Amino acid sequence: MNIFEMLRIDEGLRLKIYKDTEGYYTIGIGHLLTKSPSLNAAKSELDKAIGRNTNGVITKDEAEKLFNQDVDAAVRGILRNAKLKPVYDSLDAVRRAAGINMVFQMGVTGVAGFTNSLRMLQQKRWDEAAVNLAKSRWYNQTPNRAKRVITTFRTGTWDAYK
Ligand SMILES: [Cl-]
Ligand SMILES: [Cl-]
Secondary structure, three states: OOHHHHHHHHHOOEEEEEEOOOOOEEEEOOEEEEOOOOHHHHHHHHHHHHOOOOOOEOOHHHHHHHHHHHHHHHHHHHHHOOOHHHHHHHOOHHHHHHHHHHHHHHHHHHHHOOHHHHHHHHHOOHHHHHHHHHOOHHHHHOHHHHHHHHHHHHHOOOHHHO
16 A cells, blocks of 8 residues: 555546536546636646647546646645645654645645644644544545544554555
8 A cells, every 4th residue: 555546545536527525627536627617727727737638538547647746746745845844754654645645635735734733743642633633624524535544644554545
């Protein structure tokens, strides 16, 4: 198990544009295209990301390429953030993956204002972090996935993923 399989499990794989849990146009492995409600705007974003006139459908390879880029970007957002980085560097590999997942899902901004959680993780107070992270919209909106992520942080193992 690793970050890629992990997210492949949480996000699934779809080759035609679809709406994510928030109702935003997405494609591939959780690749967000746009927050706007216009299908054509999404199609425009897609073509631009792929480099060709796609008509809203892409290939597996193409999905995989976006994915790669996206993981990469998430790590990099982490490393460039002053609040996150320190936390990240303090963690073990398995938990790092948990942190990436979250950033992938909600953005830097997103995970960066979980200050208290951050503090607790930095301290390696896992059970406590786990309760704090659950007091969130995130958890209430996507409970099965948040649970997986939180037990990851809590246990440092991949048991939630099998
Ligand atoms: Cl892109
Ligand atoms: Cl969920």
